[PDB]
Design a protein around this ligand. Structure first.
Ligand code: HEM
Ligand SMILES: Clc1ccccc1C(c1ccccc1)(c1ccccc1)n1ccnc1
Length: 449
């Protein structure tokens, strides 16, 4: 020992926190921070869960690598969803390579030639609205992101032919992921048997396409799938098999939908809220106008990357309502932070939500102020904002996401007047995909296309 961080109280034998933590996750971890500060521990059926709040506290979590902090135990729910030997079900030698291949397929070189695809989809999608009306922005953006992701991740075969079949197989997999599924990933309920069956179907679907492509050698494709098909395990001629390629597909597909789709929605919902509109919208519209002068009606990456004021509106919707509540590692080598000592065996927690609501980090943290990031971007200290994580395993889609969300909102900002229906949605912290609560409504008054 050295000094163990404060165990959070509870009078209920054996379960301890558990019942209070599940149902109230953000609220309970938040009250723990006020009671026990920076770093604290929850016992639930004798599992120590140590929590880290604020930049000083994050440093043990994001600095250490794989032989000091492991991802496999607390991300085991992913394994039957993605498949055997995929990502967190893969041995570190095999995993980090796959993670390298994922990085290639979402690199700035790859993302340049995805932007046209991203833009076209966004544009064809929003064309098909009326002169006027009212949508659920969450639903709408959810539809579009899977649709473009279908093309960018999976290819155009899958896009033009097989989309609604894929959108079906996916809906199953998100339906085989319940609270219960994170605790017992292979529990033989029906939802998991649908899921297990779906995943096996999606493998067979991608079998069709890879056979096709290898029988037509020279025809070039521009998608993630093509990168994965040409990925090769170091030393080994080996080369990924079909079951593995789908897993990565399924993994990235999931990413789009569990996160891009919800901050996507948040950005708009927050921007077009009437006090947040009266202050931060004009600045964004003048930004579009000044970008249109330099580049024209076209959206290219070059244009999108200059959209700094909008970029911030996205980054602030991520600061306030980040889609993933916890990131997690089981501790291998023990470690120290302040006077305290975290021992081998504990699962350590960081809460993007909570750490980004800390006053001494973000002054006025309950307020929407995108332009807080003008000075924040200059700050020296690592790990203040954590929406996309950090370190050896920070997000690899952060560019892709900012791109896709900006595309959506540029295309929307330009072609429509938008207004928030009713008052701002509450967040759904106690749900599987932590979004805004329906009805997430926007009235659209079009203007002059
Ligand atoms: C607003 C949207 C998103 C947010 C907030 C987000 C957030 C994060 C966070 C916090 C992590 C770290 C997980 C950890 O600590 O182990 C992460 C990892 C990752 N994200 Fe995202 N993400 C987003 C969108 C995407 C998209 C669209 C993709 C891919 C298409 C993607 C791919 C990944 C990958 C591959 C990792 C793994 C890092 C690793 O283990 O090497 N993400 N993301
Ligand atoms: Cl599986 C996981 C655990 C913790 C945080 C994020 C993710 C997740 C992911 C996606 C693809 C490859 C590895 C991990 C993920 C996958 C499936 C369902 C939810 C989260 N993710 C979401 C957004 N960015 C990353």
């Amino acid at each position: 020992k050295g000094k163990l961080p404060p165990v959070v109280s509870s009078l209920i034998p054996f379960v301890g926190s558990g019942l209070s933590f599940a149902g109230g996750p953000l609220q309970y971890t938040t009250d723990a921070y006020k009671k026990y500060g920076d770093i604290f521990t929850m016992k639930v059926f004798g599992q120590r869960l140590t929590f880290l709040v604020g930049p000083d506290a994050h440093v043990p979590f994001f600095s250490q690598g794989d032989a000091e902090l492991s991802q496999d135990e607390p991300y085991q729910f992913s394994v039957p969803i993605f498949g055997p030997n995929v990502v967190y079900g893969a041995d570190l030698a095999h995993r980090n390579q796959q993670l390298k291949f994922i990085a290639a397929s979402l690199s700035t070189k790859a993302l340049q030639s995805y932007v046209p695809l991203i833009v076209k989809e966004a544009e064809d999608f929003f064309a098909k609205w009326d002169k006027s009306g009212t949508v659920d922005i969450r639903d709408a953006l959810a539809e579009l992101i899977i649709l473009t992701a279908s093309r960018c991740l999976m290819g155009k075969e899958i896009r033009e032919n097989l989309f609604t079949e894929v959108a079906k197989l996916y809906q199953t997999l998100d339906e085989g992921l319940l609270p219960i599924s994170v605790f017992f990933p292979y529990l033989p309920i029906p939802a998991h048997k649908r899921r297990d069956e779906a995943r096996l179907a999606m493998v067979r679907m991608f079998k069709k396409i890879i056979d096709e492509r290898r029988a037509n050698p020279e025809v070039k494709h521009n998608d993630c799938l093509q990168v994965f098909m040409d990925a090769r395990y170091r030393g080994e001629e080996q080369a990924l098999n079909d079951e593995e390629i789908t897993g990565l597909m399924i993994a990235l597909l999931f990413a789009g939908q569990h996160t891009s789709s919800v901050t996507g929605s948040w950005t708009g919902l927050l921007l077009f809220e009437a006090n947040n509109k009266k202050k931060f919208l004009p600045g964004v519209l003048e930004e579009q106008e000044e970008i249109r002068k330099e580049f024209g009606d076209e959206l290219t990456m070059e244009a999108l990357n200059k959209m700094d004021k909008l970029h911030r509106c996205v980054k602030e919707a991520l600061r306030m309502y980040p889609p993933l509540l916890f990131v997690m590692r089981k501790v291998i080598k023990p470690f120290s932070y302040k006077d305290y000592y975290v021992p081998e065996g504990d699962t350590v927690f960081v809460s993007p939500a909570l750490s980004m609501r800390v006053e001494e980090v973000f002054p006025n943290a309950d307020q929407y102020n995108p332009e807080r990031f003008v000075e924040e971007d200059k700050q020296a200290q690592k790990y203040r904002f954590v929406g996309f994580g950090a370190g050896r395993h920070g997000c690899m889609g952060e560019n892709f996401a900012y791109l896709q969300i900006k595309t959506i909102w540029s295309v929307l900002l330009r072609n429509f007047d938008i207004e928030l229906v009713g008052e701002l949605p509450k967040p759904d912290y106690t749900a599987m995909v932590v979004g805004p609560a329906h009805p997430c409504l926007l009235r659209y008054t079009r203007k002059h296309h």
